[PDB]
Design a binder for this molecule. Structure first.
Ligand code: HEB
Length: 232
């Protein structure tokens, strides 16, 4: 596998997540896939998102299946008591994910919140010309505040620009596409005033999908995870 991803900054030495290639072969978990670890379970050894699917709830909004995971879960070991609260979305048919995590979810105020994306880059190529993407975004998801918008990619010029809006929040991104590794990086702007950065990745043949995070250091409430599939 060729797993790539990123998470916004950790806020605590134990209450945090990190993304990367999954390492756990045990229970429902399989190594070698797009994964996440939490500091409260085996010092964040990562497990695969795919395996979490059959145990996660679903809230579908505007055609986006937001997956939700938190204790209690039948068959989860006691070591998992402090796993926290995950909201995450599978992007397309491949092993591509974006989402957020917090200690206590909506009921507790999304403490220790982080955003992330992670996916398998195997087989990724970039097409010629231009394409647009229907993108969804998550920031403290409560069931009715999903962000949505359109990103515009110009692969000939190496630009990715777009915006997401929802639940009173607007995030715009302006990034440069790196054709050597199909990543992108640039600025992010929240509600037209708050400066941050964007980092993300195209996945799949002919850039079938993308995922990324927009983060705002010193203004972290606006941190947003996003992803979507190419239009057509
Ligand atoms: C059922 C259901 C379930 C679920 C949902 C889960 C979810 C999870 N998980 Fe799991 N796990 C499990 C079940 C589970 N799990 C099991 C069964 C196991 C095995 C262990 C034993 O054996 O006990 C594990 C195991 C495990 C491990 C290993 C540890 C050691 O060192 O060994 C880890 C790290 C984890 C994590 C995790 C996470 C992070 C999550 C989320 C996100 N996990």
């Amino acid at each position: 596998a060729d797993i790539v991803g990123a998470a916004s900054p950790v806020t605590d030495a134990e209450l945090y997540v990190a993304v990367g290639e999954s390492q756990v072969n045990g229970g429902p978990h399989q190594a070698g896939k797009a994964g996440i670890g939490v500091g409260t379970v085996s010092n964040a050894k990562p497990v695969d998102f795919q395996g979490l699917s059959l145990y996660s709830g679903t809230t579908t909004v505007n055609g986006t299946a937001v997956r939700t995971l938190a204790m209690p879960i039948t068959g989860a070991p006691g070591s998992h008591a402090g796993m926290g609260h995950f909201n995450f979305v599978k992007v397309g048919s491949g092993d591509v994910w974006f989402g957020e995590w917090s200690k206590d979810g909506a009921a507790g105020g999304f403490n220790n919140r982080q955003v992330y994306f992670v996916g398998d880059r195997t087989g990724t190529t970039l097409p010629a010309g231009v394409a647009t993407y229907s993108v969804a975004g998550l920031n403290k998801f409560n069931g009715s505040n999903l962000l949505s918008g359109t990103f515009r990619a110009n692969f000939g010029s190496g630009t990715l620009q777009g915006g997401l809006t929802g639940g009173g929040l607007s995030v715009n991104v302006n990034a440069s596409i790196n054709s050597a590794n199909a990543s992108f990086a640039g600025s992010a702007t929240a509600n037209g005033t708050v400066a941050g950065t964007t980092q993300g990745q195209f996945f799949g043949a002919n850039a079938a999908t993308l995922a990324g995070i927009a983060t705002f250091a010193g203004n972290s409430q606006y941190d947003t995870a996003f992803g979507g599939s190419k239009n057509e």
